[PDB]
Design a protein around this nucleic acid. Structure first.
Ligand SMILES: [Mg+2]
Lengths: 54, 46, 47, 114, 367, 54
RNA sequence: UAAGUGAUCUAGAAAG
RNA sequence: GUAUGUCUAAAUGCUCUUAUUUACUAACAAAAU
């Protein structure tokens, strides 16, 4: 709650660091996980026949 | 590249070797503990 | 496979065996003395 | 003829087991393979002074050493090695051991660490 | 992913046969080859094949008079025959006492048969290893194809025209055989094959190697032994026993003697003593290893014999390295755990007991 | 797009990733690919995923 | 009263 | 990319151990959420 002006800081990280964050736009702690991809993981296997086929 | 030794078996600072050493210690240590307790018990009995 | 002793006799036999085990061990590893009976248990079982 | 060569040519009569046996028979006689101090290339982790001529061989400097097995292992089943080196200027045999208790080395009558 | 990455349906791969193995590489694929070599180190393929052959021979010996077999001759093949995939040769030639009425070329798992087609006095078994791969991983089909090819053309170094081609896909662990059969043979053969697959030493070793390559994985406690749950101490120290003696000429004759498998129930005192005979070790090598396997097999048999009420929970083993084989053999019985121990238990002095020793001495068979 | 008063979907707004962003993505991909002659296939894959997820 | 036809890149060897 | 250079006169069979490697090479490449 005291970390204010955080997004801007994150954005400006680009100029301080060599390899930057590719998720500058969000931030887990203030926003929560804006995506979740376990479903995808589950389904890829299925798509590929099931486990046995693999 | 830089530090060569890092790609050697004999090098102890190599991680695999370290792990192995730890494992050895852990097993041996456990054995000692098992025996140590027994020894203590014996002493107490005495 | 074994001789059929009476209970006392059996006990005696067991004792003798134990003694033999101890003595042999002493002969072998030149240990000074057995500390207790519970220390000798280990010797008996595990070896 | 090319480093990634899949199959080396064998003669038309090459009983592999028999061949192996033969090799073994002619391994005790053999000069190399039946000896200690087999060569190795290594950089020096200790960064130390050659005790004879005080040549300050620094960290990571590359040498063609001799690795030999020390019979007296550490604890039980984790080997330790003598790793011979020569000083650049004077040809004094520096070496060191790899005692893995501290995850590091030990100097062996060659030079001193600093 | 070797069995997809290396595979038969390749566009342009120059199919080199890998060194001292039957593992075709359709083009130079880099790490794969190394891995394969590691797996099949120290002529492993050959060992596997030979081991299988030996097993087959043993089986034949066991069931000689049941199937009317005069003699079971293991042919002195060229060492590379295991890994000559182009040609082949009869490994186990098989003489008949009376004339066999064999079936037509057919598969190992076929319920319907007809034993009125061809007749023969002599037969052969061929063992054909193959490393499988996603496209041609079907083993049975492959074996059939081989049979069609080898048997027919000119001469495929078989003494008889009729025989069988056992085939074991090492990379898929599938097995199948195809060829000619006589009445009562086929089921037995199938059983033997199954047994081999469950536990051949060479195959086990191969499996272990594969696992390693892949990095795949699956005093104080003395009073616990004597609770209401049934257990079995198993010793293997006196299984392979030898006596050494000098002749008058000087030659030290290392004569193998009749051994035992000490299997003691500590609750009831039932010593299930299997007497191993000297005829087991005839013409063998890597002997200690073989003995362990034998012991394991015996244990398995014993377990099978015991009904579900009388079966153990913890089969305790005396030695350290009697675990794995036992485990392999006891995959049929997963409920039965196999336990190691710190105790150097004194069941190696089973031969010190007189009556037992006498019994061991006076045995003319496995008993 | 919605009018807050009446709750009507009064307008549309079509989106397209601006060319600059596309270019950036491409660059990132290139970077991932370049300086990866070694890398454990899996590491590379992970990197790609990260990029793609972003 | 009338949907659902077709377009299918590739493709490995050496040395570094 | 498994470096290199100088240096050169013209006991026999036996078996048993393994679910490993005193293994060696680094020229090749180097990042996170
Ligand atoms: Mg160059």
């Amino acid at each position: 709650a005291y970390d204010r002006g955080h997004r801007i800081r994150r954005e400006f990280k680009q100029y301080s660091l060599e390899r930057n964050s590719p998720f500058w736009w969000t931030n887990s702690h203030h926003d929560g996980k804006l995506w979740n991809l376990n479903a995808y993981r589950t389904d890829v296997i299925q798509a590929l026949g099931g486990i046995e086929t693999i | 590249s830089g530090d060569l030794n890092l790609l050697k078996s004999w090098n102890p600072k190599l991680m695999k070797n370290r792990k192995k050493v730890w494992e050895t210690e852990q097993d041996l240590i456990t054995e000692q503990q098992k025996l140590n307790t027994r020894l203590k018990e014996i002493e107490k009995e005495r | 496979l074994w001789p059929s002793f009476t209970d006392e006799q059996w006990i005696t036999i067991e004792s003798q065996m134990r003694d033999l085990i101890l003595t042999e061990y002493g002969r072998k590893y030149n240990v000074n003395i057995s500390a207790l009976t519970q220390t000798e248990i280990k010797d008996i079982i595990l070896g | 003829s090319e480093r990634k060569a899949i199959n080396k040519y064998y003669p038309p009569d090459y009983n592999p087991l028999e061949a192996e046996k033969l090799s073994r028979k002619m391994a005790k006689k053999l000069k190399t393979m039946n000896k200690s101090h087999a060569s190795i290339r290594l950089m020096t982790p200790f960064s130390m002074r050659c005790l004879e001529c005080n040549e300050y061989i620094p960290k990571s400097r590359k040498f063609n050493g001799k690795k030999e097995l020390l019979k007296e292992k550490y604890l039980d089943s984790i080997k330790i090695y003598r790793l011979t080196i020569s000083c650049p200027r004077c040809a004094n045999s520096i070496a060191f051991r790899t005692d893995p208790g501290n995850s590091d080395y030990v100097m062996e009558v060659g030079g001193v660490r600093n | 992913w070797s069995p997809t990455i290396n595979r038969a349906n390749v566009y342009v791969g120059f199919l080199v046969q890998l060194d001292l193995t039957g593992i075709f590489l359709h083009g130079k694929i880099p790490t794969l080859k190394i891995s394969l070599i590691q797996i099949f180190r120290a002529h492993l393929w050959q060992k596997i094949h030979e081991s299988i052959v030996f097993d087959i021979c043993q089986i034949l010996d066991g069931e000689l008079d049941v199937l009317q077999i005069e003699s079971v001759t293991k042919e002195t093949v060229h060492p590379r025959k295991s890994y000559k995939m182009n040609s082949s040769a009869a490994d186990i030639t098989m003489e008949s006492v009376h004339e066999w009425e064999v079936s037509k070329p057919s598969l190992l798992h076929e319920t319907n048969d007809s034993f009125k087609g061809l007749i023969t006095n002599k037969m052969w078994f061929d063992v054909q290893l193959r490393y499988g791969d996603y496209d041609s991983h079907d083993i049975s089909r492959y074996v059939r194809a081989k049979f069609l090819d080898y048997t027919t053309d000119n001469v495929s170094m078989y003494p008889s025209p009729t025989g069988v081609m056992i085939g074991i896909d090492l990379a898929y662990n599938m097995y199948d055989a195809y060829g000619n059969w006589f009445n009562g043979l086929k089921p037995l053969i199938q059983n033997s094959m199954r047994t081999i697959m469950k536990a051949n030493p060479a195959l086990y070793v191969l499996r272990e190697r594969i696992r390693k390559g892949l990095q795949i994985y699956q005093s104080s406690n003395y009073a616990e032994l004597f609770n209401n749950d049934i257990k079995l101490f198993v010793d293997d120290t006196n299984v392979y026993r030898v006596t050494v003696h000098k002749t008058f000429e000087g030659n030290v004759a290392t004569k193998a003697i009749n051994g035992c498998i000490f299997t003691l129930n500590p609750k009831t005192g039932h010593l299930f003593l299997k007497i191993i005979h000297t005829s087991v070790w005839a013409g063998q090598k890597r002997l200690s290893q073989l003995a362990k396997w034998k012991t394991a097999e015996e244990v398995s048999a014993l377990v099978r014999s015991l009904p579900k009420e009388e079966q153990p929970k913890q089969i305790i083993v005396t030695r350290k390295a009697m675990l794995d084989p036992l485990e392999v053999h006891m995959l049929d019985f997963p409920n039965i755990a196999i336990r190691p121990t710190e105790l150097r238990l004194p069941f190696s002095a089973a031969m010190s007991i007189d009556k037992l020793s006498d019994v061991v001495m006076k045995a003319t068979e496995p008993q | 797009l919605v009018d807050e008063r009446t709750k009507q979907r009064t307008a549309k707004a079509y989106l397209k990733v601006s060319e600059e962003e596309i270019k950036k993505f491409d660059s990132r991909i290139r970077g991932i690919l370049m300086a990866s002659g070694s890398t454990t296939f899996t590491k590379v894959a992970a990197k790609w995923n990260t990029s793609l997820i972003s």
